[model samples]
Target: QQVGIEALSVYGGAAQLELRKLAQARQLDISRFDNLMMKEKAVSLPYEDPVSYAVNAAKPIIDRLSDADKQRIEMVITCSESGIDFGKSMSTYIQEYLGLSRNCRMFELKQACYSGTAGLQMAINLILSQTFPGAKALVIATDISRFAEPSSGAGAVALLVSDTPHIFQIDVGCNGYYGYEVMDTCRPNPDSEAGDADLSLLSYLDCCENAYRHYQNRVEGVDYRESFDYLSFHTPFGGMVKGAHRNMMRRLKRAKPAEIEADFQRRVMPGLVYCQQVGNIMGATLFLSLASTIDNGDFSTPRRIGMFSYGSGCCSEFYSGVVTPEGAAIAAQQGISAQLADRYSLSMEEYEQLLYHSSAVAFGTRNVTLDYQLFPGVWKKIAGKGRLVLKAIKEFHRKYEWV
Candidate 1:
């Protein structure tokens, strides 16, 4: 089941918002984009790992909660293809970094892009499992490090969940999930070099084709134009959503291709224009697309938004959300456009050095200051027992110590 607009308040980071603004500045109109969803602001981590991005992006929201609320959080669920450490579990590390109570369990879920949706579903189950009213869950979807050179980038999205949430309402009826054990669509092993750029692109196209077929079968009589105020897809790249949208329009053409195509353009143009500029963040990509659409579109009350999430290996989900009366207002107050507009873009040289370079230091000591200008939230040291320590940089920059 998907959470409704009343239970979720989406946020994004400076980097994500900046990318959107740059796209808009380039005159890429996103007014017609459909299937897009909420935009939750987040911050990029100094490292390239998606888990770190998740933690950083989520930390702001987590920090805003009361200590009791934090204590009541039952689990931190993370979904990411790129993890912080191959040896250490990213979830455990994130829980520690976020200062989540020891009683709060943590785990990582991997199904490629679908993992984020998996985490979301699990959070709903967690809310159902607990006895107390305060038990809550946090879901973070983050990705950094891109496969496509020159066109690659990184980012994250985070959401806080609790009983009687105010941002988005839970819709048990609007969610459907399907899984296919397809080797043609996944890398199978993260450590393997087998999943190159060409294979990645092909896998994305295949997933798009499969997702369209699945949606058509499941979403019978669903009109993309009228049913969804916005529509978004898991973007492996800018073109994956385009391909899926094209396929959906083609199917719609069985009745009225010309009319459907025009309607599709009215729905697809906005977010499609945004995706071309932001690149992709795997699990977070589709949601980012949706956020861009919502930020730019005139969303009225009771707006239905369709979402398609596909994880190569491969699992797919089709879901929808209706904008509550408060959705448009809350979204606007989140200042998505301003956040994106205020980001600082790095040059190719700076991006590469910051993203790829690493250095060794003495164990059990904090001596390095992260180049926050380059790498925004990198942990500088590990003390006793793999504890994480954020190094001091400048005034107003606080170091986070986690165990």
Candidate 2:
């Protein structure tokens, strides 16, 4: 009874700053780094939080469903490493504003960047068990990765999972997962995230190999190198993701690294198209790849897509599902590329102001200009002095605005 993605959507900072500019601002190696990432931009959220992106990203998927289908939603699962309030779940705010049923079970999931896949898995499990015969689950992977201001950026992705999948259905038996204790990445401060870059690269490549091997054994006798029309990974950066492709090719016993690199260009690069714009979106990365692959129209003839998800602290899962026509249609309709194009690019000075503005939201008595917001709904960015209803940190207790 596992449902697939009926609808899908994503949203992030409208204000994108070129990584080259940022690296240059901090006096880093601009030439080498810019060439490495291939001109990717970091998604900056000046006036947004996990909740803001959650509601913004989720609204599109929810709007596409019929009212009857919306009423059938029994669960709302949200994933995010960046939380507005440490104690309260962001889903509650999303549910209230999205108008999901009061009977729905809502909570937040966190496992670094892997929480989104976990939420998707949990939705599949709950549906297959027949806990509620006609029930639907709304799974959202919402996040904003901050290297602690003057830092990197991330985004959000949402999936509506149900038995009547308009998007690709989940292939139940086609799954492989690996998890163990490790601190390759973590958040020691509320406003900061740090990681051992080299360790992360090694861990990601190793896990991909292990998970794909397990999947090979489970399926028995189909080389993933050829079977999967496309494969996507959790992209912390373009540099590392490219390396994962190369590492897999060597493991597959290619004669030359170029053999795999060329294959990746044909089978994999379409999925990474959006990463060229959004940069690292943490838990939502894989889903973004999925959307990119579908939107590219490269597999209109039908093919299998493999997804590898990894979260720091750390956990990983590998799975594959087909590209059904209906699935591709739903993905194609999102218009996300157009939406992304409409974002207001911030200048360097404006970016610095937004960076320091993070402090004002926490301590200042004045209202801030909520600029990154795109969708106008219960949430609106006021120009001058007005409350930021989406998030309020008053005396350590959190508050939200429903309307």
Candidate 3:
């Protein structure tokens, strides 16, 4: 049975900050920005949380469906490391806000950056199982954290998975997943992250190789360099992705420096465009790269994309899928690039102020009214834009309002 992503949408938050300006503000060397390959990062305002991001991202997809079609959405999976509560699923709020059928299996998944891949896989299995028949599943991957302020950004990607596979067709049973204990990175605390940067890089590089090797062993006649037309990786930052790509090309293909550079430019660079702009949104980053690749790469002919997803602490997977020109056209209608360009760019001073203001709605805050006017300039931009934002918290219950 055909099973894969039927549709996809993205919400990159209301505001953004240029990384170059951020680096200059910190008095860092300009050359470092070149290595990170980050341009701008979407910054969620005080009112936005994981729920709001998920809702806003999924809204577009839901809005296009007829009532009957919408009712067929029997599952909602929210994938993220950033959760609002310990036991309560963010999927509940997302389902309520999106007006999805109550019969849905609303749940949340947390596996760092790998959560998105897991959610997608679960939804794919549901479609392939034939148990749900015609039912579709909504998979939303979102995150918001100031953990690594420069690299950490806020955003979400909502994917509609069904047997139709209008957007991307998955190669059933072609996954090579690997995981084990590692202290590479973790959110030991609710609102922050901790880890060894070098260790995480090492783990990512190691997993990239092992996962693909496992994939090669399972699928006969698989070539890393020739089998796939494009590649997408879970990008913590562009530098790490660049390094990972280099490692794969040298170790797997034994290609020399100049050839590898050309390969990176051709196969991997297209996927990094949106990732470079949005920074690292944890769980949702890989899908963001996939969306970027589909939108930016040549798709006149059907193309295969090799995907690698790695989450800190760490689980990793190597997967492959096919996208036809029709799928590319469906994805292009989202106008992700235009929405990204419309973000309000926050100045360093305003960004510094945001750091303190965002704490108003932190993890354990029992009750607080969100200050939409905190960044008066940003308010003007998001106001009347018809996007959702957190309005207040009342006795532990979160309330959101449409702007």
Candidate 4:
């Protein structure tokens, strides 16, 4: 039996195409054809107080799945560079928000952007294991906040995998992991000086180059021109993938010139489209690009696709999958194009205020309404402590106490 993405759903701030305009100016259009539903202002967590974006983004997708689909799900996995609470596990929060069954095992996978692929591989392994047959997994890759002062690295992606009917069978090809201890990327400590930005960029480029070389060694006979319809990667910036793609094509010039050139163009085009809009979503970057390709690009039945994932401070992996017949149909139905067109755009000042300042921070009793469609219930302030209370009825709000 083959194993692959049977069915999947994606949710996040960058998951919406309109918000991607920042990256589009740089020439990326990954979400050009996909639909994204947005509500509430996109919030980055931890530093900027943007917790719950992942859980909120994931709730809708989980709710949309069939009861049996939720029941069959045996595992819950999450991938994020920055988590909701430093000490508390983000997966536990997600599992509770989605209302997963008690029997399901859940955990958070970290390695920066590579965790999504890691989670995917873990689910694949569990499915192939003799211990669990007819079981499914829910994989969520979400990150709301990036750095505070400078740089753009924030977003999330959600996916549901099962043995049901959908695109690409799992276990079609092998995957390889590459690890290197290097200081190519580092996050700023809230207490550190502000001059550390340049150092981070240099490290990012160094690690990116290192990852490219590792990926090249592993791509032996996989002809991009013929074997794969498209290729995607965890993009930290618009230029990173271009740099790697150029290097890869130059390396493959002698072995498969014609096919390499053609397929390289095809693969790079979709990624370029996505990076132009979303900036870099860290852990969810590659999968977000993949989702954009599925929602926007054209693929024949049984089309093979290549994926490369990289995380700064740094880990890398290469994997392949085949898009099934149903996969193509599902991609068309996701309505990515319409979603991209309907998003509300914020002015630079407004965007900055939303990103940097909080509106509901009085620390007193306040009535908050779930006006936004994307509002995953309501978060209310209870008494002196700002407890996130959930709205019980459409118009009725209740104070929540942790049981």
Candidate 5:
């Protein structure tokens, strides 16, 4: 019984801000743009929360499924560090909005950026168990990066996992996981994140190498260069991923600068396409990269993709999966790139005002109605789109409605 992602969809918020514009406004060094390799980042409106992002990303996939197949989704897992409540999982809200079967095992997982992979692996096991044969699992990874403003991104990726495996087929038992306590990066509070940048980068490179080494031990006859056609890493920024890839090539392949550059373009650039556009979406970042790889890479022939996932304080995994040309077509139908392109680009003034408006729905706000006219211009972009948005919170219960 094969098990993996059957379908996937991504929801970047209705508005975006060009990093270059933000850099100019913040008076940051403009010369370093090439090093950062960041272009733009999705900006969630005041009315968009993790739950809304999750539902928006998922509704399209659910709409494509037959009623019978939709009901087979017996499990719904929300992966994020941006949960709105401690006791109640975001999955409950997501499941309700998606109109999934009530007979579902729903919960949320948090491991910083690794939350998505944890949810995915758990869903994979549920399918392999065969206890509930033919059942599907809905795994939605969503987040809103409240800090690190320039590199911060807001978005979600919803994946349907089942034996059908139309988009990606997981390699059974081919997982390499490495983890330890590292105070590199984390959300110490609901509204902010703190970490040592240098330490986080160092840890990321260390895990990238060690995780792949563990993968080598488990899978016989694996070569760093030839075993997989492409590579996808959890991208905090494009530069970080480029550095990690450079380190791997130097240590494992002993390749020079020119060879590394060509290889990076060939095997790594496809995955970075979407990550560069959306910045770091925490737990959902890797899958965002995977979706980018599948949609952007050449899949005329079935290809194997090697993926590395990392989270702060910290857990990591190296895994492999196969994607067929048909899978690429299936993923392409979602029109993710167009969605990113269609987002309203916010001005620096509007962006700054959004930061102030965000306070209304900050963590633990017991009661408030969201300001729909907060940004009249931005509101116009999503209005009448049939998308979910946070409407109000009554006695701490989040209320949502389609617009």
Candidate 6:
């Protein structure tokens, strides 16, 4: 069975942050954060949290699927760290809302940001094992990367995984990874997720070193660099990807340190395009980076691509795969960039209010309306029982409405 992504979809909203706005208020280095935001644009979790993020992301592709194709989805795997119910998996909500097959194996996978890649691998395994032939799976990678007031960012990236020739072919079983007990970053409570930024940076680099070396040893090539066209990493920021790529160059002994840095600017800049715009998307960041690079159109003729996925609490994987000609053709048809163009910016106060909303502050009472074409619009807070995303929340019984 040929395993690859048939369709990929993403959801973000109008609430964007100016990183400099954040830095200026935090009394941090304005120049640094300004440059960071200048490249890595700001996206925020606006109307919906993880529930809406997953649905909004997967809905379009699910809508486009033929009835026959919908039936082929045998599994629904969700990867996320921003979860609402600690007891129930978010995939349970998504599976019923999307109306996937009853036979579908549904569950959530968590491993920080790397969880998505791990879920992808599970989908690949499901196909290869032929437990259900001609099967497809929905893998939704969703998260709102936040600690305190608008810390990182948010994203919802969903892909259809099947024996379909839509995107890059998985060179399954060819992967490398390393992990350890590391407290790089974590959510200590509902109030906030916290992290050691300096330590996180070092951990990212250290994990890359382990995975890259392990990848080289396992592959037969004397120079694995010859096998790859473009490389992308889990982007915490635009700069971190450059750091990883430059580190790869150093390990490959491909150039002088200065020369490798220059090569990074040349070859890897396109991959950072969306990350520069979306801030930190956590579990979805690497896939978002991959889609950006795939759509950028300037890569070499080689079909094999390299990807490094990382999750803080620290686990990282380095993997390579080939893209079928038909698959590459399919990827461009539903490119993510065009959809991202619809984003709406947020005022600093507005963005902070969203953070407060996540923190359980009262939003007062608001009216409800549904004002879109095929899909329904939403009342950000009050729509009573028929709201489309999550509805009311309590210490127990978090209610989500499909309608």
- The candidate maximizing lDDT is 5
**Measured by TM-score, how close is model 2 to the native structure?**
0.89
lDDT of 2 by residue, 1-403 (tens): 4467778887855557766777788887877565556454545444556776777778777776789888999999988887766666878878887888999898999998899999999998887888788888988887775432322466788888878767777778778887777778788777677778788777887788888888777887767677888877887666677888888877786647778778778777887778767877778888988888788747557778889999887788889877877677667777888767756566677667666666655422245444334323212333331222345545544445533
lDDT of each: 0.56, 0.73, 0.91, 0.56, 0.92, 0.71
lDDT of 5: 0.92
| TM-score against truth, every candidate | 0.72, 0.89, 0.99, 0.73, 0.99, 0.86
Cα lDDT for residue 179, candidate 2: 73
Better of 2 and 5 by TM-score: 5
Model 5, position 48: C-alpha lDDT score: 90
RMSD per candidate (Å) reads 7.6, 4.0, 0.9, 7.8, 0.8, 4.7
Q: Count of backbone clashes for each model?
A: 35, 0, 0, 26, 0, 5
Candidate 5 per-residue C-alpha lDDT over 196-266 given as tens digits, one digit per residue, 9 for 90 to 100: 99999989988998889999999999999999999999999998898999999999999999999999999
Off by over 4 Å in 6: 25-29, 34-46, 146-151, 222-224, 299-302, 324-329, 361-388, 394-403
Q: Candidate 3's residue-wise lDDT over 1-403, tens digit each? A: 6899999999988899998998898999888878788888888888889999999999999999999989999999999999989999999998888888888898999999999999999999898889979999999999998536788989999999998899999988888988899999998897899899999999999899999988998899999999999999999999888899999999888999999999999999999999988889989999999999999999999999999999988899999999999999989989999999988988989988888777787889999988788878888888887889999999999999988
> Model 6 clash tally?
5
- After superposition, the stretches of candidate 3 with alpha carbons farther than 4 Å from their true spots are none
Selected candidate, larger TM-score, 4 vs 6: 6
Q: What is the lDDT of residue 366 in candidate 5?
A: 95
TM-score of 5: 0.99
| Number of the candidate with higher TM-score, 5 or 6 | 5
**Residue pairs clashing, model 6:** 14-344, 39-276, 40-276, 41-276, 41-277
Better of 4 and 5 by lDDT: 5
Per residue, candidate 4 scores C-alpha lDDT tens digits across 1-403 of: 6566765554434222234444445464545323221112233321122224455445555766789877888888888766433555567656765678888887788886678888888887777674778888877776644322222544556666655537655444356666666665555442122334355455554544555445446666655345567778776554556556655566645545566556656676675454445456667778777777776567765666677787766677777777765787886676544544433344444455443533332112145432222322211211232222233222222222221
Candidate 1: count of backbone clashes, pairs at least 3 residues apart or interchain: 35
